Structure 1
Amino acid sequence: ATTYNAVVSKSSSDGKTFKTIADAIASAPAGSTPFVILIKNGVYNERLTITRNNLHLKGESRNGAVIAAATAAGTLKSDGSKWGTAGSSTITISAKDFSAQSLTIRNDFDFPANQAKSDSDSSKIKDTQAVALYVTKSGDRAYFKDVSLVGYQDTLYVSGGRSFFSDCRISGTVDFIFGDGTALFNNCDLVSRYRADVKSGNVSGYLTAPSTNINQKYGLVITNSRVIRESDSVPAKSYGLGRPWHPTTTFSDGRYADPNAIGQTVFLNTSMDNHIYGWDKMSGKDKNGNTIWFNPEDSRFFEYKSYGAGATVSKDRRQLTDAQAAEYTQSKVLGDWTPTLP
């Protein structure tokens, strides 16, 4: 039993359809009854902010139904101010019980073309984060099935509550899954991208940059997945599994890297190609304005039964026991929430 409240299409000959996804979402009655939108194949150049609870998008196909926009953190607004990382997102989820199925979400900011620009080019952006999907503190219970997320730096920003990614593709370079949310990934392809701008022997990127609060039980949990290189040109030992993001945060005594954002990333039963070297450190600014380094050994970085060429076991790559691994089931990670589609 599946029925649609609204249909989005590129064709006028399709029938009683909306031309834009934003229009279809806006047409939903105020409230929290389920609202399900079918999105027919096409590229929809739109930026969306979801504020209605119990909204559900279903694409005709992951390959063919695309929601895309090009926005970097350093892209300037009309008033001349920057969008910023949060502000750069193609899709922002600020409601509960959202789901998306069988669609692609892209940030089309051309990171490689930006980096290839001459240093004196005033159009060359320094703030190169460009978010495809952002789940905010107001999104809890967000479910993404058979979804592809496309970007380079900061592709997926998961904050606040619980999100679940299933049968997914996520691509990027630097910190491409990051934030303080409880985010579970099952049967996903995590695709590390080629960096034309990085010298041989330097780091090309980091899969994760968790900012999980120390009192929060679960951060980024990746299960039954595949950690893969985009191409053979992605060098061996060029990508970190994670580095600890301690976000600049406003406190009573100033604005500086959050000491209690001691991130968790756990990989269970996940394949890894040899582009992976292990975990890494990350820097921020402390309460005095000095550089401060946060180390992987002080963070909640673990693996369980990784395989493939990138899966070395060493003192620098901590392993869960069987008993500890049992704590990372879908049931335990997501608690009372069972992700379901309409």
Structure 2
Amino acid sequence: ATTYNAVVSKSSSDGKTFKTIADAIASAPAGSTPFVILIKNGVYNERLTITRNNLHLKGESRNGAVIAAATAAGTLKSDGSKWGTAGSSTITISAKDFSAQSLTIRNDFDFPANQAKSDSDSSKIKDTQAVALYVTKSGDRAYFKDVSLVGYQATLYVSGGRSFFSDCRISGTVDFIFGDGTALFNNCDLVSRYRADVKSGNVSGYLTAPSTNINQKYGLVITNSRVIRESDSVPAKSYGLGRPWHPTTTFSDGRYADPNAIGQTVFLNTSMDNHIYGWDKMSGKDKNGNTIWFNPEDSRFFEYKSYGAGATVSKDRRQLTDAQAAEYTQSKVLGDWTPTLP
């Protein structure tokens, strides 16, 4: 028995429906009773911020129900200020017990077109992060099933509590799954995209950039998934599995890269094509303003039973034991939360 509180559609011949997703979400009564919105096929050019608990979106199909907007971190607002990375997100989840099912969420910032612009072009953006989906510090228990997330740099920003991604597609280039959240991915395709602007022999991107606090048990956990190249033009050994993001953070003694953001990315039973070379380092600014490098060997970067041509076992790619792997079950990673759909 499944019923919808609101329906969104492009058609006026459809009937008693909302024309925008934002209107349907806003129509929800104040409170925390479940509110479920059906979104009929179409491309909805909208930016959304979810602040109501227990809100659920269901698209007609992943292929055909699309929420999309184009915003880069370096895109300017009316007051002349930049949106910033967090501010660039197409969808922002700042509530508990959110779910989205059978829909695509895109940031349509045309990264390749931007990079192709002449260096003297004033419209060429340097701050090229363009987030599709952002789960904030206020988000916990966010569930995404049969969802496609589209972007280049910084596609998925997972902060705050626990999120679960199931039967998913996520595409991107540089740090396309990043943040300090507990984010579990099961049976998703992680799609590394072609970079026309990267020279032969240089790195095209990094799947993950975790900023997991050292005291937090789980960061980014990827299980039973596929790490795939977008095309045969994506070179061998062009993508890192992860690099350690130590976010610029305001402390009592200044603003600098967080020393305690010692990120975790763990891959279990995941296929990898040969575009994967292994893990990588990442730079930030220290308390004195100097460049500081954070190394993968000092980070919580692990694999368990990877397979496919990108799945090499060396001293630079630490492996879990069977006993250690058992600590990364859904039950342990998500704790007392069982992700459920309405």
What interval of TM-score do these two structures reach, taking the shorter chain for normalisation? over 0.9
Moved over 3 A (4+): none
Corresponding residue SS for 2:30: coil
Matched pairs, number: 342
Shift, 1:215, TM fit: 0.1
CA distance in 2, matches of 1:260, 1:114: 34
Shift, 1:92, TM fit: 0.1
Write out per-residue CA displacement over residues 66-125 of structure 1, whole angstroms, 9 at most, x where no aligned residue.
000000000000000000000000000000000000000000000000000000000000
Write out per-residue CA displacement over residues 33-75 of structure 1, whole angstroms, 9 at most, x where no aligned residue.
0000000000000000000000000000000000000000000
Write out per-residue CA displacement over residues 96-155 of structure 1, whole angstroms, 9 at most, x where no aligned residue.
000000000000000000000000000000000000000001010000000000000000
Shift, 1:191, TM fit: 0.0
CA distance in 2, matches of 1:327, 1:127: 38
The 5 A counterparts of 1:21-36 are 21-36=21-36
CA distance in 1, matches of 2:308, 2:66: 31
Corresponding residue SS for 1:85: helix
Corresponding residue SS for 2:176: strand
Q: CA RMSD in A?
A: 0.2
CA distance in 2, matches of 1:17, 1:229: 39
CA distance in 1, matches of 2:151, 2:41: 20
Q: Which runs of 5+ in 1 are unaligned?
A: none
Aligned to 2:211: 211
CA distance in 2, matches of 1:249, 1:221: 24
Corresponding residue SS for 1:195: coil
CA distance in 1, matches of 2:37, 2:165: 19
TM-score, normalised by the number of residues in structure 1: 1.00
Shift, 1:22, TM fit: 0.1
Shift, 1:340, TM fit: 0.1
Aligned to 1:7: 7
Shift, 1:214, TM fit: 0.1
Write out per-residue CA displacement over residues 241-267 of structure 1, whole angstroms, 9 at most, x where no aligned residue.
000000000000000000000000000
Write out per-residue CA displacement over residues 315-334 of structure 1, whole angstroms, 9 at most, x where no aligned residue.
00000000000000000000
Corresponding residue SS for 2:22: helix
Aligned to 1:263: 263
Q: State the identity as a percent.
A: 100
Shift, 1:299, TM fit: 0.0
CA distance in 2, matches of 1:23, 1:29: 12
Write out per-residue CA displacement over residues 203-246 of structure 1, whole angstroms, 9 at most, x where no aligned residue.
00000000000000000000000000000000000000000000
CA distance in 2, matches of 1:53, 1:137: 14
Shift, 1:277, TM fit: 0.0
CA distance in 2, matches of 1:2, 1:177: 32
